[PDB]
Amino acid sequence: GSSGSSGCVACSKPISGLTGAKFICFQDSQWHSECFNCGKCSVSLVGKGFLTQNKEIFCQKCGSGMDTDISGPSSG
Ligand SMILES: [Zn+2]
Ligand SMILES: [Zn+2]
C-alpha cells in the first residue's frame, strides 16, 4: 500500500523498519512480538500456532470449532 505509512496495528507506533526489531507481517499489516496474541485472552501467539476466523486472530483452544451440535451456543 504505497499511498502512506502506518504503525503496529495493536498500538500505532512506527515500527523501526528493518533495524533488527522482532515483528510479524500478517495481511501486510504490522504487529510486534509483545502485541501478537489471542484477542479473547491476550496469550502470546509468538511460537504457538494461531487460528484465523471472521478475520480475527485467536488461540487453538478458543478457536476450537468443534462440530458439537446445531443448537446450544445460541438463545435456547
Ligand atoms: Zn506494539
Ligand atoms: Zn485464548
Swiss-Prot record:
Please describe the organ and tissue distribution of this protein's expression.
Testis-specific (at protein level).
Every copy of the LIM zinc-binding domain together lies at 9-69
The record's subcellular location field reads: Nucleus
> Which residues lie in coiled coils?
none
Functionally, this protein is described as follows: May be involved in the regulation of spermatogenesis. Stimulates CREM transcriptional activity in a phosphorylation-independent manner.
Q: How does it assemble?
A: Interacts with CREM (via the third LIM domain). Interacts (via second LIM domain) with SPAG8.
Q: What is this protein called?
A: Four and a half LIM domains protein 5
Record organism: Homo sapiens
